[PDB]
């Protein structure tokens, strides 16, 4: 009579769990290397009626996996590549004076050196244009800025660094829960839950200050600061609309090739065709104003609505966070975005051209054990992108709930991964289970 | 908007007295000890955990914004200024005496 507990199988159970993500893609590019398995055009989402699930942003380790997965790729792409250590020979230089726009003066140097031919016994004079950013004076003549740091390398310019979406799929017996709620706070339960066995691609693209090409917020601009009272935390900001940005590298770039050993081509910058001009970026002025108004409305959700909100010029620190940077067009750029923050907000022609800079020696991420040369790319660079959000920080020590101010900040790439990954969590399916029954086992 | 208060003023308590001090604050609370001519040191943090190597005499409790700190069996070596802190904000020091 008394109930017997008995076996059932395949009953849904969720456990929070972590497994290694499986890479997949639509259909050489560094980001996919074409090694990711191609995947089916069948995003068969399953709405989960009557369920809710906790999701905690900044707790998911998919973010961490992505963060190190891309690093491993980056190194993998460079391990085949030729070392540039012959370039630590000191250089004679002059400031370039040929057709220089006045605000470009001293930006480039023409320099030369006694570096070797591919023959073991011979040397040749060599010269190239260089950005002033990539060199330091040998004494109060120049040397590459990284010769006192781990060695510079570069080869294999053919590989593309343009972003390609990357998809991640749960291992069999696991699934990816997601939250569709347009109002979702970075943490806690979500009523909108549905699931997929895999996810839509996410681009590897990075920025040091503003999110680029991210998914738009579903309803309204949103902010995810974690516990906002702690101002050491980065403030995520997600636009619910795109902001177009156009940029250029107006100089007509040309290329030179050098042999530094057998089989070892070395890229060098040819003289620019035409007048030298600064790299720049155009954004709508009006749109920038409008979207800031959307942002401050969001900020006020945590404050009295008559509070003062301010934006500011960057507080400095390392250039990689002091300025906005991107690899669009296959070449690195930096810009002075501080003009974008020259405003304050109170209760109650059509565009801007930001100045920019180019550095060819890239020290990736926070690492100091590696550096690489970026090859010249011939012609004018053009770039078009959608700005989809901001990485912001807030000054500590404010009082009387007013005059809060903000600056661009962060630059840990992990937060970029989070801007997309907050939508998902990985769970483990535990099909096994038991329940009481009126049944007792049959006689043998 | 974080705010905090404290009631200790300064205390005249005799040696070997168990003594207490209290504060209240918005957010997480950490308590510190300091002596003239010296850097502050952590005693208890997040309203409940002693820092490693803190003497057994130290203790405390939390009730929401309420925070209590005590020293069992106070020793002459324990006469010091004390603090309550939340992030960048800290209460002005208070101190033991006799």
């Amino acid at each position: 009579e008394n109930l017997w507990v008995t076996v059932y199988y395949g009953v849904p159970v969720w456990k929070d769990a972590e497994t290694t993500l499986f890479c997949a893609s639509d259909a050489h590019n560094v980001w996919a290397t074409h090694a990711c398995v191609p995947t089916d055009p069948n995003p068969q989402e399953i709405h989960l009626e009557n369920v809710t699930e906790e999701f905690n942003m900044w707790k998911n380790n998919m973010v961490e996996q992505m963060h190190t997965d891309i690093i491993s790729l980056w190194d993998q792409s460079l391990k085949p590549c030729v070392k540039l250590t012959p370039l630590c020979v000191t250089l004679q230089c002059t400031n370039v004076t040929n057709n220089i726009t006045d605000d470009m003066r001293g930006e480039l140097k023409n320099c030369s050196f006694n570096m070797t031919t591919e023959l073991r016994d011979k040397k040749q004079k060599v010269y190239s244009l260089f950005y002033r950013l990539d060199v330091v004076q040998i004494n109060e003549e120049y040397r590459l800025i990284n010769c006192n740091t781990s060695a510079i390398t570069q080869a294999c310019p053919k590989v593309s660094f343009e972003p390609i979406p990357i998809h991640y799929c749960a291992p069999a017996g696991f699934a990816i829960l997601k939250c569709k709620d347009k109002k979702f706070n970075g943490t806690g339960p979500c009523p909108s839950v549905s699931t997929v066995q895999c996810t839509h691609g996410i681009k590897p693209v990075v920025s040091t200050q503003l999110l680029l090409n991210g998914s738009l917020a579903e309803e309204e601009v949103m902010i995810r600061s974690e516990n906002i009272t702690n101002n050491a935390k980065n403030i995520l900001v997600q636009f619910n609309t795109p902001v177009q940005i156009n940029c250029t590298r107006p100089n007509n770039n040309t290329r030179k090739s050098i042999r530094i050993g057998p089989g070892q081509a070395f890229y060098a910058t040819g003289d620019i065709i035409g007048d030298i001009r600064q790299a720049h970026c155009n954004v709508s002025k009006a749109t920038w104003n409008e979207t800031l108004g959307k942002v401050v409305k969001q900020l006020r959700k945590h404050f009295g609505n008559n509070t003062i909100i301010r934006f500011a010029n960057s507080s400095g620190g390392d250039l990689e966070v002091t300025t906005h940077s991107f690899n669009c067009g296959g070449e690195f750029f930096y810009c002075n975005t501080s003009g974008l923050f020259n405003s304050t907000w109170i209760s109650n022609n059509d565009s801007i051209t930001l100045p920019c800079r180019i550095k060819q020696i890239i020290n990736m991420w926070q690492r100091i054990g590696q550096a690489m040369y970026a090859p010249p790319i011939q012609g004018v660079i053009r770039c078009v992108s959608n700005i989809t959000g901001l990485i912001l920080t807030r000054d500590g020590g404010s009082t009387n709930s007013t005059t809060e101010t903000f600056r661009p900040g962060g630059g840990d790439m992990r937060d970029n991964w989070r801007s997309e990954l907050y939508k998902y969590k990985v769970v483990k399916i535990e099909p096994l289970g038991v329940a009481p029954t009126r049944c007792k086992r049959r006689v043998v | 908007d974080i705010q905090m208060t404290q009631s200790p003023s300064s205390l005249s308590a005799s040696v070997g007295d168990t003594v207490t001090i209290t504060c209240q604050a918005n957010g997480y609370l950490n308590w510190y000890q300091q002596r003239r001519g010296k850097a502050p040191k952590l005693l208890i943090y997040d309203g409940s955990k002693l820092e490693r190597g803190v003497p057994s005499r130290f203790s405390g409790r939390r009730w929401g914004q309420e925070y209590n700190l005590t020293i069992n069996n106070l020793q002459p070596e324990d006469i010091a200024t004390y603090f309550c802190q939340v992030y960048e904000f800290v209460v002005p020091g208070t101190r033991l005496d006799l």
Partner: nanobody
Amino acid sequence: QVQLLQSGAAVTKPGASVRVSCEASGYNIRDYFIHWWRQAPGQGLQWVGWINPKTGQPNNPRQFQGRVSLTRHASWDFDTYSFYMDLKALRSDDTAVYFCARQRSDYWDFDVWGSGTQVTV
């Protein structure tokens, strides 16, 4: 030994620009925020700012804007790190004991303090 090196005391005439410093010792600096604190003698501590040592990124109160700067440095073999604080000008109310601290956790736990130094005007 995790303890920070602390630079010596100094005094200058008003309007002077000054520098103070500290150095990382027993731990990987990359994982912790560094903070600066100051106090008038006879007074409770005042937060000065923080710097993210990985990026060199300062954070200061509106009170100190444009008057103070924070920097960070590292050994070329990266086994040491240094921090500096600069003041553009001094006034008698800038006299304080100044010190470095380590943020142990997100509760702004300070389990490491420099001995501090005395800056006077």
